[PDB]
Amino acid sequence: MERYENLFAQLNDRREGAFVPFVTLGDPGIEQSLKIIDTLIDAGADALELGVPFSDPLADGPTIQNANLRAFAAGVTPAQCFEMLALIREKHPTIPIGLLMYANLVFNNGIDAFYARCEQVGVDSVLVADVPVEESAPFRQAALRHNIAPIFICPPNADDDLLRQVASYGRGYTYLLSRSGVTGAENRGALPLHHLIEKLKEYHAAPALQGFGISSPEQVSAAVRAGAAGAISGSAIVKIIEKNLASPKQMLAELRSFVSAMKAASRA
Amino acid sequence: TTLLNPYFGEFGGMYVPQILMPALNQLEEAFVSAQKDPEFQAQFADLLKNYAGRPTALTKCQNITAGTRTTLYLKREDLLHGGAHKTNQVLGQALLAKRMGKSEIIAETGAGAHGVASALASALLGLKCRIYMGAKDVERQSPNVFRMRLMGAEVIPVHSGSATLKDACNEALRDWSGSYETAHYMLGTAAGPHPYPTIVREFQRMIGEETKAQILDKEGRLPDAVIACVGGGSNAIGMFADFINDTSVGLIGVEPGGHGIETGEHGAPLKHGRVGIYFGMKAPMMQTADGQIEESYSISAGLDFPSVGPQHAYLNSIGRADYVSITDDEALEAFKTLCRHEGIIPALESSHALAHALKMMREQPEKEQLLVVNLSGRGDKDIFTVHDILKARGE
Ligand SMILES: O=P(O)(O)OCCNS(=O)(=O)c1ccc(OC(F)(F)F)cc1
Numbered sequence: 001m002e003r004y005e006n007l008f009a010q011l012n013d014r015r016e017g018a019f020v021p022f023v024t025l026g027d028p029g030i031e032q033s034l035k036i037i038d039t040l041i042d043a044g045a046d047a048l049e050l051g052v053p054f055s056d057p058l059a060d061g062p063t064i065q066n067a068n069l070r071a072f073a074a075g076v077t078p079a080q081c082f083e084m085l086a087l088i089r090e091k092h093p094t095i096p097i098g099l100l101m102y103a104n105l106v107f108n109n110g111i112d113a114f115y116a117r118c119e120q121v122g123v124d125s126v127l128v129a130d131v132p133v134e135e136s137a138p139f140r141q142a143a144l145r146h147n148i149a150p151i152f153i154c155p156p157n158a159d160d161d162l163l164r165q166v167a168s169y170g171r172g173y174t175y176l177l178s179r180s181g182v183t184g185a186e187n188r189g190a191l192p193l194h195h196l197i198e199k200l201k202e203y204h205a206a207p208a209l210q211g212f213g214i215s216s217p218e219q220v221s222a223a224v225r226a227g228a229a230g231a232i233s234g235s236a237i238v239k240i241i242e243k244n245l246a247s248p249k250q251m252l253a254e255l256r257s258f259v260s261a262m263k264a265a266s267r268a
Numbered sequence: 269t270t271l272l273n274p275y276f277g278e279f280g281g282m283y284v285p286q287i288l289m290p291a292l293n294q295l296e297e298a299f300v301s302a303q304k305d306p307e308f309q310a311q312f313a314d315l316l317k318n319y320a321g322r323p324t325a326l327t328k329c330q331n332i333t334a335g336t337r338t339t340l341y342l343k344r345e346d347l348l349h350g351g352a353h354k355t356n357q358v359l360g361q362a363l364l365a366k367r368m369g370k371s372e373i374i375a376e377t378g379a380g381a382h383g384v385a386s387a388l389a390s391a392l393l394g395l396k397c398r399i400y401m402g403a404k405d406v407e408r409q410s411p412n413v414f415r416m417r418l419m420g421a422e423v424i425p426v427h428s429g430s431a432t433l434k435d436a437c438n439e440a441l442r443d444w445s446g447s448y449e450t451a452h453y454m455l456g457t458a459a460g461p462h463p464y465p466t467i468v469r470e471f472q473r474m475i476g477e478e479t480k481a482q483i484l485d486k487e488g489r490l491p492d493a494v495i496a497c498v499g500g501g502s503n504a505i506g507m508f509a510d511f512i513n514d515t516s517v518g519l520i521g522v523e524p525g526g527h528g529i530e531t532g533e534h535g536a537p538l539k540h541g542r543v544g545i546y547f548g549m550k551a552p553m554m555q556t557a558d559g560q561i562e563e564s565y566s567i568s569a570g571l572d573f574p575s576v577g578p579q580h581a582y583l584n585s586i587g588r589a590d591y592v593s594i595t596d597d598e599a600l601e602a603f604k605t606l607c608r609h610e611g612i613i614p615a616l617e618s619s620h621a622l623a624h625a626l627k628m629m630r631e632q633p634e635k636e637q638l639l640v641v642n643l644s645g646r647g648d649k650d651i652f653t654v655h656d657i658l659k660a661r662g663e
Pocket residue numbers: 022049050051059060064100127128129130153175177182183184185211212213214215232233234235236285286287
């Protein structure tokens with residue numbers, strides 16, 4: 001969890017927001033995914049959000065559904081994902097790495113054993129998309145025992161009780177949801193979130209990253225201007241992978257151009 | 269926090285994205301309030317009696333038990349308006365949707381019987397109904413697609429994954445997570461996140477209450493066992509609930525064996541799966557060794573689902589209820605037997621329950637036993653699929 005603390009301290013010094021891409025590990029294959037991730041980092045990614053392919057990702061829209069499917073077509077398993085995470089950490093000692101999990105993959109062979117493996121490969125946070133705060137106790141306890149930040153969701157319909165819980169329970173960063181619905185670049189968030197950002201800061205929550213529907217540099221700037229510590233973009237990144245499956249070279253060139261632009265938008 | 273216990277032992281819970289928790293809490297509050305509201309209860313009772321036709325008959329077989337000491341009654345949910353037990357709890361949930369000010373209904377359907385129930389209640393009560401249905405089921409349960417569309421509902425084919433009930437369930441939840449302010453998710457079985465397993469049971473429990481009163485009137489005693497097929501668990505928990513405290517009454521749930529348990533092409537997670545977390549609930553799952561949710565298989569679209577409701581997992585764990593499986597071929601033979609020797613065309617789902625009852629009788633034909641099968645629906649949706657299968661044999 002300390003890699004996030006170090007990142008946000010450095011970004012605060014430079015009056016900078018964080019830009020955090022999401023991709024599915026192993027999409028479209030293990031080798032190309034590792035190259036994709038190296039390009040995301042070289043182009044300016046401040047941290048990573050990394051999905052482990054799951055059979056039924058019910059918080060994801062079609063773009064990331066298809067990313068999961070491509071990884072499965074390449075035979076990618078959670079065990080291979082942990083192999084990949086070790087290789088990423090070996091190359092990149094300081095970048096914060098957060099996993100996007102669904103509950104059954106964490107629960108399957110023991111919750112404690114899952115977070116132990118996260119600690120052994122050098123993961124910094126885990127977000128379990130289908131575990132609300134009300135069900136979170138064994139997950140967040142296991143995370144903290146293994147020095148893993150448990151990532152909580154602050155939705156736009158959050159009441160005061162929820163803001164206080166996520167501020168107290170969370171570590172690393174607070175996930176500020178742009179909108180209702182599932183992941184996807186096509187639906188862009190509607191209501192401003194200034195109130196929630198300010199309450200989270202009042203309650204000493206982990207710094208807020210906005211996500212869902214962030215697909216353009218203007219949206220990244222707007223998140224920072226509204227007071228958030230940064231922004232996460234997944235479907236817009238994955239769309240570049242989908243569009244360039246037959247040209248891996250062009251795929252990385254467009255990913256680099258997009259990430260650098262999205263990162264530039266986070267700089268004051 | 270919740271008003272009611274979300275768990276049955278270790279099973280159950282509310283494993284949904286945080287965004288959906290206010291909708292679940294709102295639904296739970298509306299349910300608790302409605303259960304105390306005499307006006308809601310009277311409207312629900314009125315619809316069940318004068319619109320749906322309750323109470324349903326309890327029919328004594330006679331031909332198919334001849335030469336044995338089994339007495340077999342069928343609880344005739346096939347006679348309910350819509351053609352299946354699904355109508356009972358749809359009427360209650362539709363009233364809940366209106367109580368919460370929702371104007372739209374989302375539903376999943378496999379057999380199409382819950383889709384038809386959702387469409388007819390939405391037509392009656394003024395709701396705009398959209399129904400997700402796997403594309404395989406759109407074909408093999410096609411009569412219910414025609415019925416849904418003729419009542420004005422939107423039927424959305426789902427081509428993803430196995431293109432069956434699980435995949436429809438995924439799309440329904442994904443939709444709800446972005447539309448819950450206006451749409452109520454009318455989940456069709458006793459599964460999913462709390463409060464659905466509780467609501468669905470309470471809105472189906474008249475099945476077992478009527479059965480108890482009817483058996484006592486006709487036989488002067490409780491049944492030895494009540495038998496029901498188990499997809500997500502609604503018709504079985506509806507039959508079981510009023511008998512749970514009558515410890516002499518066996519509670520037998522029948523999961524689909526598909527092509528045979530040993531083939532892995534089945535829908536029997538309660539006896540052949542492993543506890544996991546999916547579709548909002550901690551419950552037995554068909555899953556791979558590393559925790560991917562599998563695809564199920566059954567000849568019967570209504571049972572073709574890789575999990576089961578949490579109260580059944582709990583009743584099994586403590587030994588109060590016993591669960592078994594019946595294969596495609598066993599279900600088909602029971603379907604033919606009921607058509608030809610009692611003049612009732614059963615749903616293929618319900619045929620799994622009947623097949624196990626006929627096995628209990630045939631295996632021990634001198635055992636005196638008084639049995640009730642929940643005949644959860646009629647087989648009009650299955651006649652073209654079954655006819656094709658039998659024609660390909662010869663029969
Ligand atoms: O840019 P988009 O719209 O594709 O957003 C994708 C971001 N990916 S992620 O791992 O942060 C992410 C975060 C939360 C999710 O569900 C939950 F909110 F319920 F937890 C799902 C994915």
